[PDB]
Design a protein around this ligand. Structure first.
Ligand SMILES: O=C1N[C@]2(CCc3ccccc32)C(=O)N1c1cncc(F)c1
Ligand SMILES: O=C1N[C@]2(CCc3ccccc32)C(=O)N1c1cncc(F)c1
Lengths: 305, 305
């Protein structure tokens, strides 16, 4: 027992990280088969960043201007393309450490692990959620661009995020691996509105199920609610509306625990309206929304990769 | 910027995990050079666990009774020894994936990453602290025994923890890699007192420095305190007493931020006495004690491995 914010083991991703340098800019790239993926802003200088003309900047570059190094080994670049906000550098050697992988574009409210890297070298791994407003709340310093987010299922890494930018508000934005930003963001040094975020209701409920499974149960009550009444409360407290598709995804946890989804909703309603009264749940003094129902089931059943 | 509970990248450890089976018991082992380390309780059955005579149990076993499998490859066991609460199985092949490593016995209040594994296969990685009472608050299911905790410095993995037991209270206990338990615990199915825990004061202060560095600063105040006055407050609130050695370890963060250690203590005093008043710090609604001052500096400066 116990319940922790757990990241996927990072080794399969560590073997894919490289350093990419173009002129004076160094950031991270991802080497899969004979292609390295990295943020296109590797080609800018500081004069460029307020509104770069990436097509003109890239026309000034040739294959030999992209320095790609995998630990101590230098890769030979034999082609370059820009796809949306990523560059794709074709190299003459397939990465021998390429895992089975896919590129996925995740939905808001889903979670993934981030392998934070600098200069091509891994620093740390942590779990986090794509916010409803398509930002992430990560830990990224200058040099972390090109660090990636991923999930693993069996032996297959699904890459879902590449880090590009810190907004002036301190939150993070990035792309899928086809270079399309999550959210309205653009790769330029401007203030950019993220727009209203909400709490991920289905994930809070999953975490309360994890709490009961672990024996933290003080917040269960004698009450029930309806999906309509709960959603009135959700709106007042800037929670995502709960839908029947959400109720259905919580089915396994409801079955495991015997606590009907709408009964758990009535526990959550009371927590929203009354607070935690100075108490904690699974070590937290707030309602946690970065565990999906699948996360909870996986951790509670010890699934491996 | 941003600040997250970050684990070390786990790849160097993933390459060392194996499954060890003795009779009907399967748990995890750690294969370094030509030795596999695992909990000695792999040799017990359920009849044994209330008070096993490990010396008699191990005398009934021979090399060929220890089944060791590294993914799909079977290892040949050519010797076996018990050291304290660990078994050491000598194998005929050195692990080709052995990293540079050391065995360390950590101090209470220090942190490390855990690679949770089942049947020799990694499940997830998370960070956590050795509590002052020598327990850890992990996420471990049946089958996780033999999972290890570690830190990495440059290219060198320091293994500090091997998981053995969940206490009836739901918290976790284990050994160093020489098989000596942290704390008063024994490897038998009995209720066992952990004794009084406290909050790790030097780590709370480091985290408040991390918060200021990140711009969460609402808790800074106009006050100062003395080490003696602060320690009176620490005692009332079951915090570890702060010593000058602690003040000295916080030196770099004090220098970085310009906030004297005793001034940060006066912020902490006010938080202990008044609470957080419904506010958060670095996403948390409680005072966080699982980041060491070294953790904070590393994460704030993007150190890699
Ligand atoms: O390295 C850079 N470069 C920036 C400057 C502003 C900018 C605009 C477009 C693209 C990239 C960049 C940026 O946001 N980051 C950064 C990322 N994460 C964490 C950080 F601390 C900094
Ligand atoms: O696998 C086992 N086996 C136990 C039973 C009781 C016991 C006593 C001595 C040694 C070992 C064991 C034990 O504590 N765990 C366990 C560990 N972590 C998380 C869990 F959920 C269970």
């Amino acid at each position: 027992s116990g319940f922790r914010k757990m990241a996927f083991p990072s080794g399969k991703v560590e073997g894919c990280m490289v350093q990419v340098t173009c002129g004076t800019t160094t950031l991270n790239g991802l080497w899969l088969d004979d292609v390295v993926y990295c943020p296109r802003h590797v080609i800018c200088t500081s004069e460029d960043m307020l509104n770069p003309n990436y097509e003109d900047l890239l026309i000034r570059k040739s294959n030999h201007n992209f320095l790609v190094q995998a630990g101590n080994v230098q890769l030979r670049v034999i082609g370059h393309s820009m796809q949306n906000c990523v560059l794709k550098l074709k190299v003459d050697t397939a990465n021998p450490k390429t895992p089975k992988y896919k590129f996925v574009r995740i939905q808001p409210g889903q979670t993934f692990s981030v392998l934070a890297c600098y200069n091509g070298s891994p620093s740390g791994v942590y779990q986090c959620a794509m916010r409803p407003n398509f930002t992430i709340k990560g830990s990224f310093l200058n040099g972390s661009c090109g660090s990636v987010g991923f999930n693993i299922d069996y032996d297959c890494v699904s890459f879902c995020y590449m880090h590009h930018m810190e907004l002036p508000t301190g939150v993070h934005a990035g792309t899928d691996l086809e270079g399309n930003f999550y959210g309205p963001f653009v790769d330029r040094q401007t203030a950019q509105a993220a727009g209203t975020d909400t709490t991920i209701t289905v994930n809070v409920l999953a975490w309360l199920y994890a709490a009961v499974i672990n024996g933290d149960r003080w917040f269960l009550n004698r009450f029930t609610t309806t999906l309509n009444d709960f959603n009135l409360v959700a709106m007042k407290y800037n929670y995502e509306p709960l839908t029947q598709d959400h109720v259905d995804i919580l089915g396994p946890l409801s079955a495991q625990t015997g606590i009907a989804v709408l009964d758990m909703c009535a526990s959550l309603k009371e927590l929203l309206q009354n607070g935690m009264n100075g108490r904690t749940i699974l070590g937290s003094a707030l309602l946690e929304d970065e565990f999906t129902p699948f996360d909870v089931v996986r951790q509670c059943s010890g699934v491996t990769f």
